[PDB]
């Protein structure tokens with residue numbers, strides 16, 4: 330298990346948590362020095378439990394599929410909540426089994442679904458450590474509309490930060506003040522599977538992408554990533570979705 334406490338949190342302790350999160354994900358290879366997530370894990374070992382504590386010390390446990398980072402559901406007091414999707418129902422067979430009741434959320438875990446439920450795109454949802462504190466609090470008491478927005482915050486401040494060093498730094502900058510994610514942040518989130526695939530296709534292609542990945546940069550400019558010498562590959566991305574799962 331990995332843990333993060335919002336009480337007394339700072340860029341350092343958050344950095345420690347994201348490091349722990351990455352280190353809890355199993356790999357047997359690195360591709361271009363980046364850990365390659367496993368094709369599959371069987372049984373309960375497939376799911377990492379993240380223990381998150383809001384400022385007041387209240388807690389949720391979040392279940393994360395270790396092969397893809399995907400958060401399937403969470404436990405709040407004695408109630409479990411899972412996304413409305415086959416992978417999450419499968420997760421419900423292994424985690425939070427001692428919960429008194431199980432609620433299936435009325436949406437899948439997809440942005441194309443969470444943004445609809447929340448009533449807003451995540452370009453307009455501020456993220457940061459204060460937002461994460463809020464998200465935890467929201468998820469403690471069931472409210473499906475509010476939970477959608479909370480989950481958008483949760484996903485980006487945990488999973489997306491684990492995958493991209495840039496996103497981790499974005500959140501560290503938002504330690505004490507929330508701000509909507511940069512265009513670059515959104516771009517990276519949307520491109521993770523694409524980038525993972527192309528970095529893997531590059532291993533037999535002299536480090537060259539079979540298909541270029543288009544990203545927005547930090548200055549707000551749109552750029553083509555064509556090979557492994559790009560800063561996104563050498564410095565930014567921290568985890569690769571296995572092509573078996575793409």
Ligand SMILES: NC[C@H]1O[C@H](O[C@H]2[C@H](O)[C@@H](O[C@H]3O[C@H](CO)[C@@H](O)[C@H](N)[C@H]3O)[C@H](N)C[C@@H]2N)[C@H](O)[C@H](O)[C@@H]1O
Nearest residue numbers: 397398399400401414416437438439440441484488489
């Ligand atoms: N991004 C990683 C983090 O956020 C995901 O959310 C995103 C899923 O990445 C994407 O992929 C799958 O999402 C759902 C899970 O299968 C499915 O509904 C969907 N059909 C799939 O495409 C989807 N496209 C958008 C959604 N924004 C997670 O579940 C998660 O908790 C994880 O830590």
Ligand SMILES: *[C@@H]1O[C@H](CO)[C@@H](O)[C@H](O)[C@H]1NC(C)=O
Nearest residue numbers: 537554555556557558559560
């Ligand atoms: C690789 O990417 C860099 C940009 O990061 C670019 O300057 C260069 O032209 C690319 N090389 C190839 C072979 O595509």
